[PDB]
Design a protein around this ligand. Structure first.
Ligand code: CLA
Ligand code: CLA
Ligand code: CLA
Ligand code: CLA
Ligand code: CLA
Ligand code: CLA
Ligand code: CLA
Ligand code: CLA
Ligand SMILES: CC1=C(/C=C/C(C)=C/C=C/C(C)=C/C=C/C=C(C)/C=C/C=C(C)/C=C/C2=C(C)CCCC2(C)C)C(C)(C)CCC1
Ligand SMILES: CC1=C(C/C=C(\C)CCC[C@H](C)CCC[C@H](C)CCCC(C)C)C(=O)c2ccccc2C1=O
Ligand SMILES: CC1=C(C/C=C(\C)CCC[C@H](C)CCC[C@H](C)CCCC(C)C)C(=O)c2ccccc2C1=O
Ligand code: SF4
Lengths: 98, 153, 42, 33, 107, 80, 67, 734, 48
């Protein structure tokens, strides 16, 4: 398996899990935690004028609600698992338990 | 032979320590008349030393490179006599004491001024309470199960 | 003797009697079984 | 003159700067607005 | 004084172990201790020790072994007395062990 | 200077005032105790902080209560 | 009606700032005046750090023990 | 705000006495207690102060670099490192006599100099930095960073950039950035340095800023990384014959996991450390992207604490409400921070000696001792401060009604159990450790060392035997060849690790014995007792049965009067103050143990420690009396030597350690009634009625004098032991 | 007489005289400016 094939397959199978399988769990956990609450109020509600949850980057169209940040997240997991596969395979290491 | 320690009956440094101490005592034994009382006390100390080293030989003590009996307190049966068989013999006796002095404190807890029995110990009451702690472990066990060991505030 | 047994019942007199007896016990044990580092009696 | 520079600065930091700082901070200690 | 007197003359009290003067060796260190043990009393104060004692008294009430003579930390004056007492004892016994070991082992 | 605040657990025994070496305290009329009096503290500016008032207060913890605070020449026990 | 516990009733203390907190005591007397804030005089077996065995407590700073 | 010098406090400014000066010095950095203070202004002052501290850190490092560049023999040290002495800085003392100039001339210097026992030579030589111009450039850059931190601290005090209170309370974005960038990108950048510079510098060529864009750290270059063939970065590990600083026996690998030491330097491989910092960079960059900041993903630390409530209520309400008692409380943040920092500082000390990272730092023996002693005393102090700030949190910042029944209030619910079981553990340890030490003292006294109670540390020897140390015959996971641990790692790092740990000459997992057991239990006594004092002062910070209103008196207050039996040293500050004594004792034990074990290893007679560490007259004779000969002979009547300064500092530390006893033993009241007589004498002495104080000269305050005695005590402790540990380890050098 | 001009004068005159007389002090007044004036001896363990 060439490394381009490995990277592409693992990334595809990561954001496939993110788009279809582990979407409702991730999103319901997100809604459960919700926001970082500083003394009941949120970080932006209490002030700071910099911790506003960006919506111009999260408004992207999808029938299920996939955004570019989930594309980065599932896909960072993708490239990470791909490089774990690639390095672990390219390292001729003998666990030699037996 | 645990922890890289030769036994003391086989350790050459242990026998060398024995011979060194014995020569140190004999060099002090020469200054006295062979029938005199200091000389006899030194000879008794010499036999005490010799049988001390023999007994540390026969009781399974392990000697290091320095040549001194080390105690293996981990749990090996061969060396339980170094820590656990004494240790239980401590926890018994110690738990005798605390089970006595606690019980006494419960027996003089219901007095009018119970502090004048702390400084003036009722020897009859204390002598009745002292041997209650002979078989203290079953009393402490049952009082733990009956809840009488821990006050409920 | 009345009120002497109360004095001998006092904490320091009783402590010195108990610890003198106990110390003599330990001392005579160490005379009988000197230089002990193991309990070999099982 | 680079082996002479310790002779310049060790007094200037150790005698002169302590006099400056002690005087200035003693005035700041006793000031009243 | 640290080198030619304290370090130099306190060689016989450390080589004392073995020969008769081993007690003077021992009474060196123990005296060295009790002096330092006094520093527990002089430096500290009754309040900390009373609060530690009340925690330990809680630990004793939880086993029906509460004493009737209520445990109180030493009086402030008594803490100072115990401190100066152990301080003088330890320092003076250190000096006594040092002196006697040195001078019995050299003259 | 200091802050000698008292609390309503006072019983009107008049020992905090009889111990005070600077007249910080004074008994006033009150209706909260059997003795019908309580120990005020007007002259807190004269308080040295010696806490004889609360080394004589026979309550469960304390009623008179000295909180050490800004130290003036009257509160630092200074005759110079 | 006499308010509070009785002149021999056993009681325990719920006052956080007391020496005898969560410790039982004996009610000496209860002041029946409804203007004294701390009427319940309690007597304790063991002295406090001030070598005092009694203090007046409130009605809600006290709890009639069931023993 | 106020008028006189404590402008931050109009209570000390309105103090006629000299207490104004002292307390305005002391309470200067206690921004929480100043007048007209807000949480916003408190946070902003803290931020600017952090900038000032970073500026001073970079300035101090620039000073080290400048004084090694200007006055150091660093260009000569990188030629023959293990036989040329480092030079910290020059010395221009106009009080020096000509013999002292003849004596302090070391390292092949033009004049008198000081020997760098700090290890900056070894560390700088290991990370590159060959010529003195490199150190000059580094000092210039750190001066620039000092000015940058000063600029930032001034800029973030102006109104246009004064950050808001809710910005310092963003406890998710800060963790995200600090894990990802401060911890991860910084470890990644240190890997970049170790790969582009320090590994080429160890293997000859000097990759500097002018020629680092046109040299390859690996001959292929980013093919292995992008193609995933990362094993190509572990091809030539410069095996077993590499001369550090020259290309003889060098290699091409940059991230090979070898384990163990260099053969020449007896330090770790720069390829190992490059791969290390790379690995933890990946781990910290991954761990950064955890806390939700702005982007709709991540955790909220609130709903992690709020959600970690166990059913059954064994903890109680769990961590329900603990985000607010840390985010809104800077003393909880500071206590946790100093706790972690003390743990990892002790870890730094315990790993830098046994796994030395720098070239020829295991070969200079005084450097290792100075470093271990330094970081361990720093760690003990930082730990004492962690606990002191936990106490200050419990007094100043703890809100019980906000955190009812949670995992933090349950501390105070059963604080007596914690304090009493710490008071059991410490009491047990002291009784038995001292009993065994005294038993062995008496046995050696009575000439019967065979009667000693020499309890072998089987449980640490078993761990050493679980790491490959074949010195006890336990045959455990890594000492046994037939095991899963000696199979899954026998091809990667266990060769080097085994060949390093089995070497009896290095500090890696030293061969221990019964003296090591006994002193480890003394160490446990010290840790448990310092912990007891500190935890007891933290949990009795809000109040006790003797003083339930302690929270109303603040952290530092003298006492509560002589009433109620006596309330001397009842504050949580006083608990801290007594715990500094027990801490200094504890670190003195750990460092005495370290220094004697290591000086006996370096000398060669490990048997000396093994037969002499079990009884305390062995510590007094064979360590303190024996190793202090060359020290106290630093200046004798017939001459002096290079250790004269350490003899003088030894006696100086003795003098101030004894002067602290004046303030600790002798208390106030005697001194106020003395200074009253002195004030009388000044006001009635002719030609001195002209001169009159403006600040009324009162004696030192009580809590102040406990602090001053503790400061003299600790200064003397530290200076005395530094002098002894450097002079003894530099008088002979192993 | 002028204090603000006396404090400044004493500071910038004392510091000047001190940093001057120390600079031009030959190797006869104070020995720190002489130098070693002796062959430097090797340290323990070769030099380390
Ligand atoms: C806490 C630390 C510690 C420990 C563990 C020990 C341990 C020991 N020391 Mg050391 N020692 C210590 C502190 C310590 N010492 C200190 C602080 C000092 C200075 C004061 C000394 C000074 C010292 C000296 C000078 C000597 C010792 C000796 C000994 C040994 C005691 C042998 C002996 O007489 O007991 C024998 C057992 C007893 C006395 C207990 C008997 C209890 C009674 C009879 C009741 C038991 C029976 C009971 C009814 C239960 C039966 C069961 C059932 C049928 C009911 C032992 C190895 C001696 C030795 O042999 O050297 C190794 C010795 O000469 N020690
Ligand atoms: C905090 C860092 C630090 C420390 C502790 C020292 C410490 C010392 N310096 Mg160095 N120095 C430093 C930073 C530091 N320096 C920096 C950043 C510079 C570049 C401006 C210098 C430039 C320098 C010179 C040129 C000289 C010293 C000298 C000295 C010594 C006497 C003090 C005077 O200095 C004056 C202090 C400064 C110029 C620093 C201002 C910031 C002393 C050992 C003297 C020396 O070598 O004595 C042997 C000396 O002549 N320093
Ligand atoms: C009379 C005793 C005495 C005195 C006064 C000095 C004086 C000095 N020695 Mg020392 N020395 C002495 C005896 C003495 N020596 C002896 C007997 C030996 C043994 C042979 C030595 C060995 C020795 C060595 C080995 C070195 C010195 C150095 C120095 C110089 C330090 C440079 C300086 O001022 O930096 C500034 C001083 C400091 C930073 C230290 C003061 C720290 C203060 C107290 C703490 C901070 C307090 C607070 C924040 C600020 C308050 C003050 C504020 C108003 C400014 C200085 C001239 C060094 C030197 O010349 O290098 C340049 C050096 O390396 N000396
Ligand atoms: C990725 C972006 C980023 C980065 C790099 C930083 C970096 C920093 N911030 Mg943070 N910050 C950020 C984002 C970031 N911040 C955001 C988004 C916010 C708003 C939420 C804040 C809010 C904030 C506050 C409120 C404060 C900081 C502070 C700091 C400084 C920490 C002090 C220090 O030097 O620790 C250095 C510590 C380390 C590098 C960790 C090392 C620990 C390891 C485990 C030790 C062992 C290895 C050791 C390094 C080896 C030594 C060997 C040899 C080289 C000596 C540091 C400059 C503080 C400061 O100082 O202000 C100026 C401060 O008060 N920041
Ligand atoms: C933040 C750290 C950092 C930085 C700024 C750089 C920057 C650079 N690296 Mg380095 N590199 C780093 C970390 C870093 N690298 C790490 C962690 C590794 C190990 C995987 C490498 C391994 C590496 C190799 C093997 C090569 C570079 C190369 C380069 C250059 C071209 C990058 C395209 C550039 C100067 C290439 C180059 O041209 O060398 C200068 C090159 O061949 N780097
Ligand atoms: C990251 C490290 C750090 C930080 C930011 C702080 C910050 C602070 N500490 Mg903490 N502390 C630390 C480490 C730290 N400390 C350590 C390591 C210890 C253990 C020794 C302590 C022990 C400690 C105590 C015991 C107390 C503080 C207090 C304080 C506050 C006021 C400081 C003051 O008045 O003295 C400023 C100090 C000086 C001007 C110098 C004093 C002279 C010293 C002895 C030598 C220098 C401030 C919030 C105090 C507080 O909360 O106020 C009630 C307080 O009582 N700290
Ligand atoms: C050598 C000096 C020394 C010694 C021995 C101790 C001992 C102790 N300190 Mg420390 N302490 C010291 C100095 C010392 N301290 C100093 C200088 C300070 C600074 C003020 C402190 C501050 C301090 C604090 C703040 C705390 C302690 C605590 C403790 C206890 C810790 C538990 C332990 O190890 O008990 C084991 C017992 C010992 C080590 C006692 C040794 C004596 C022997 C074993 C008893 C038998 C001797 C002999 C047979 C009696 C006969 C003599 C006579 C009747 C004729 C213990 C009593 C803690 C505490 O008490 O809580 C438990 C605590 O919270 N101490
Ligand atoms: C840390 C900084 C520091 C520095 C750089 C010096 C520098 C000096 N000291 Mg030291 N000293 C210091 C700290 C320091 N001292 C401290 C902290 C103490 C207390 C322990 C002492 C105690 C001390 C004593 C007791 C003596 C010295 C002496 C000396 C002089 C060297 C003797 C010699 O060979 O010259 C010989 C040179 C001369 C005799 C001519 C002196 C030239 C003077 C100083 C010029 C006047 C300058 C100016 C007008 C006054 C200062 C202005 C102010 C702003 C600083 C030299 C000027 C000796 C000395 O000279 O006495 C005066 C001496 O006896 N010092
Ligand atoms: C007072 C207070 C405070 C402070 C406190 C402190 C200061 C603490 C400390 C603490 C500490 C200082 C701690 C430490 C700890 C540690 C631990 C807990 C450990 C663990 C470990 C482990 C778990 C291990 C494991 C392992 C091993 C064994 C080795 C190898 C690897 C492994 C991983 C396997 C605060 C602020 C908080 C709050 C308030 C109160
Ligand atoms: C250690 C210490 C304490 C605690 C010391 C205690 C409370 C006194 C020691 C009492 C002994 C241990 C009581 C036990 C002796 C009994 C007679 C019981 C005998 C029965 C067996 C133990 C033999 C203080 O109260 C104190 C007060 C003021 C300043 C400094 C300090 C101080 O340093
Ligand atoms: C000696 C002593 C004094 C006398 C202390 C006097 C009044 C203060 C010190 C005298 C002068 C001011 C020496 C100053 C020494 C240092 C040079 C000052 C360093 C401070 C700078 C860093 C700012 C006390 O007042 C005292 C009070 C309470 C308990 C114990 C003691 C105590 O032991
Ligand atoms: S001493 Fe206490 S109870 Fe008595 S009058 Fe004063 S405040 Fe009231």
């Amino acid at each position: 398996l060439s490394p381009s094939i490995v990277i592409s397959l693992s990334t595809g199978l990561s954001l496939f899990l993110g788009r279809f399988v582990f979407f409702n769990f991730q999103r319901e956990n997100v809604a459960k935690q919700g926001l970082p609450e500083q003394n009941g109020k949120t970080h932006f509600e209490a002030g700071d004028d910099r911790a506003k949850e960006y919506v111009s980057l999260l408004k992207s169209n999808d029938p299920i609600g996939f955004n570019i940040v989930d594309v980065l997240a599932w896909g960072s997991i993708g490239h990470i698992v791909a490089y774990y596969i690639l390095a672990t395979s390219s390292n001729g290491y003998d666990p030699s338990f037996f | 032979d645990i922890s890289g320690l030769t036994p003391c009956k086989d350790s050459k440094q242990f026998a060398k320590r024995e011979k060194q101490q014995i020569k140190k005592l004999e060099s002090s034994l020469k200054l006295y008349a062979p029938e005199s009382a200091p000389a006899l006390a030194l000879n008794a100390q010499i036999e005490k030393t010799k049988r001390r080293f023999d007994n540390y030989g026969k009781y399974g003590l392990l000697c290091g490179s320095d040549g001194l009996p080390h105690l293996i307190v981990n749990g090996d049966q061969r060396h339980w006599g170094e820590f656990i068989t004494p240790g239980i013999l401590f926890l018994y006796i110690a738990g005798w004491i605390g089970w006595v002095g606690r019980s006494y404190l419960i027996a003089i807890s219901g007095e009018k001024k119970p502090a004048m029995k702390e400084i003036i110990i009722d020897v009859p009451l204390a002598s009745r309470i002292i041997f209650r702690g002979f078989i203290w472990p079953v009393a402490a066990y049952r009082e733990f199960l009956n809840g009488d060991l821990i006050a409920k505030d | 003797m009345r009120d002497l047994k109360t004095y001998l019942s006092v904490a320091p007199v009783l402590s010195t009697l108990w610890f003198g007896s106990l110390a003599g016990l330990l001392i005579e044990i160490n005379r009988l079984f000197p230089d002990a580092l193991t309990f070999p009696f099982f | 003159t680079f082996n002479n520079l310790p002779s310049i600065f060790v007094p200037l930091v150790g005698l002169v700067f302590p006099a400056i700082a002690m005087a200035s901070l003693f005035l700041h200690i006793q000031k009243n607005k | 004084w640290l080198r030619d007197f304290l370090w130099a003359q306190a060689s016989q009290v450390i080589q004392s172990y073995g020969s008769s003067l081993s007690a003077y060796g021992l009474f060196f260190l123990g005296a060295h201790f009790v002096w330092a043990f006094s520093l527990m009393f002089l430096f500290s104060g009754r309040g900390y020790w009373q609060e530690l004692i009340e925690s330990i008294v809680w630990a004793h009430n939880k086993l029906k072994v509460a004493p009737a003579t209520q445990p109180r930390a030493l009086s402030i004056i008594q803490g100072r007395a115990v401190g100066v007492t152990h301080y003088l004892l330890g320092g003076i016994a250190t000096t006594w062990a040092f002196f006697l070991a040195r001078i019995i082992a050299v003259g | 200077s200091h802050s000698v605040k008292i609390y309503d657990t006072c019983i009107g025994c008049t020992q905090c005032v009889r111990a005070c070496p600077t007249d910080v305290l004074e008994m006033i009329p009150w209706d909260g105790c059997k003795a019908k009096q309580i120990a005020s503290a007007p002259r807190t500016e004269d308080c040295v902080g010696c806490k004889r008032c609360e080394s004589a207060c026979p309550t469960d913890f304390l009623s008179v209560r000295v909180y050490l605070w800004h130290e003036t020449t009257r509160s630092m026990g200074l005759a110079y | 009606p006499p308010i509070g516990p009785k002149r021999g009733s056993k009681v325990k203390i719920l006052r956080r700032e007391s020496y005898w907190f969560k410790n039982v005591g004996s009610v000496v007397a209860v002041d029946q005046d409804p203007k004294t804030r701390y009427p319940v005089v309690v007597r304790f077996a063991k002295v406090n750090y001030a070598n005092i065995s009694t203090n007046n407590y409130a009605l809600d700073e006290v709890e009639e023990v069931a023993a | 705000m106020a008028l006189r010098f404590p402008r931050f406090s109009q209570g000390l400014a309105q103090d006629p006495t000299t207490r104004r000066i002292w307390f305005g010095i002391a309470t200067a950095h206690d921004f929480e207690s100043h007048d007209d203070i807000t949480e916003e202004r408190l946070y902003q002052n803290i931020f600017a102060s952090h900038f000032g501290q970073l500026a001073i850190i970079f300035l101090w490092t620039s000073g080290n670099l400048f004084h090694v560049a200007w006055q150091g023999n660093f260009e000569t040290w990188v030629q023959d490192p293990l036989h040329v002495r480092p030079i910290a800085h020059a010395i221009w003392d106009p009080h020096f006599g000509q013999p002292a100039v003849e004596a302090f001339t070391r390292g092949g210097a033009l004049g008198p100099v000081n020997i760098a026992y700090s290890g900056v030579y070894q560390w700088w030589y290991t990370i590159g930095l060959r010529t003195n111009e490199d150190l000059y450039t580094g000092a210039l850059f750190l001066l620039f960073l000092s000015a940058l931190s000063l600029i930032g601290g001034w800029l973030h005090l102006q109104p246009k950039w004064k950050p808001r209170v809710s910005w310092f309370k963003n406890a998710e974005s800060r963790l995200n950035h600090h894990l990802s960038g401060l911890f991860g990108v910084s470890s990644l950048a240190w890997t970049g340095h170790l790969v582009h510079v320090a590994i080429p510098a160890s293997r000859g060529e000097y990759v500097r800023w002018n020629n680092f864009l046109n040299v390859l750290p690996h001959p292929q270059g980013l093919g292995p990384l992008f193609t995933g063939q990362w094993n190509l970065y572990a091809q030539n590990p410069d095996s077993s014959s590499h001369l550090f600083g020259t290309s003889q026996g060098s290699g091409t690998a940059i991230l090979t996991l070898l384990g163990g030491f260099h053969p020449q330097t007896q330090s770790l491989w720069l390829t190992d450390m490059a791969h290390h910092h790379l690995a933890i960079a990946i781990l910290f960059l991954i761990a950064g992207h955890m806390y939700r900041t702005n982007f709709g993903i991540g955790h909220s630390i609130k709903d992690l604490l709020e959600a970690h409530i166990p059913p059954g209520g064994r903890l109680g309400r769990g961590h329900k409400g603990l985000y607010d008692t840390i985010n809104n409380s800077i003393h909880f943040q500071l206590g946790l921070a100093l706790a972690s920092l003390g743990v990892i500082t002790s870890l730094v000390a315990q790993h830098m000696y046994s796994l030395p990272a720098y070239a020829f730092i295991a070969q200079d023996f005084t450097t290792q001792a100075a470093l271990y002693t330094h970081h361990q005393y720093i760690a003990g102090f930082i730990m004492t401060g962690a606990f002191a700030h936990g106490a200050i949190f419990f007094i100043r910042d703890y809100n019980p009604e906000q955190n009812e029944d949670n995992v933090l209030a349950r501390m105070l619910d059963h604080k007596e159990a914690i304090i009493s079981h710490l008071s059991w553990a410490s009491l047990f340890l002291g009784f038995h450790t001292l009993g065994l030490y005294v038993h062995n003292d008496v046995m050696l006294a009575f000439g019967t060392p065979e009667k000693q109670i020499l309890i072998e540390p089987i449980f640490a020897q078993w761990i050493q035997s679980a790491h490959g140390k074949t010195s006890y015959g336990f045959d455990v996971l890594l000492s046994s060849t037939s095991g899963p641990a000696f199979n899954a790692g026998r091809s990667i790092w266990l060769p080097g690790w085994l060949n390093a740990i089995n070497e009896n000459s290095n500090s890696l997992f030293l061969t221990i014995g019964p003296g090591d057991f006994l002193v480890h239990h003394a160490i446990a006594l010290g840790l448990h007792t310092t912990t007891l004092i500190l935890v007891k002062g933290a949990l009795d910070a809000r109040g006790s049965k003797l003083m339930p209103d302690k929270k109303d008196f603040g952290y530092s207050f003298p006492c509560d009067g002589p009433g109620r039996g006596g309330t001397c040293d009842i504050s949580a500050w006083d608990a801290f103050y007594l715990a500094v004594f027990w801490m200094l004792n504890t670190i003195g034990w750990v460092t005495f143990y370290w220094h004697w074990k290591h000086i006996t290893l370096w000398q060669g007679n490990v048997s000396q420690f093994n037969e002499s560490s079990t009884y305390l007259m062995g510590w007094l004779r064979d360590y303190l009396w024996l190793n202090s000969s060359q020290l106290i002979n630093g200046y004798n009547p017939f001459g002096m030597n290079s250790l004269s300064v350490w003899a003088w500092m030894f006696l100086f530390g003795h003098l101030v350690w004894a002067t602290g006893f004046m303030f600790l033993i002798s208390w106030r009241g005697y001194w106020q009634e003395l200074i009253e007589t002195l004030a009388w004498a000044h006001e009635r002495t002719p030609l001195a009625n002209l001169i009159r104080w403006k600040d009324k000269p009162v004696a030192l305050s009580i809590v102040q004098a406990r602090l001053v005695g503790l400061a003299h005590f600790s200064v003397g402790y530290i200076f005395t032991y530094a002098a002894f540990l450097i002079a003894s380890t530099s008088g002979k050098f192993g | 007489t002028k204090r603000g001009l006396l404090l400044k004068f004493l500071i910038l005159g004392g510091g000047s005289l001190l940093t001057y007389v120390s600079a031009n002090s030959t190797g006869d007044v104070l020995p720190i400016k002489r130098g070693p004036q002796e062959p430097p001896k090797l340290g323990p363990r070769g030099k380390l």
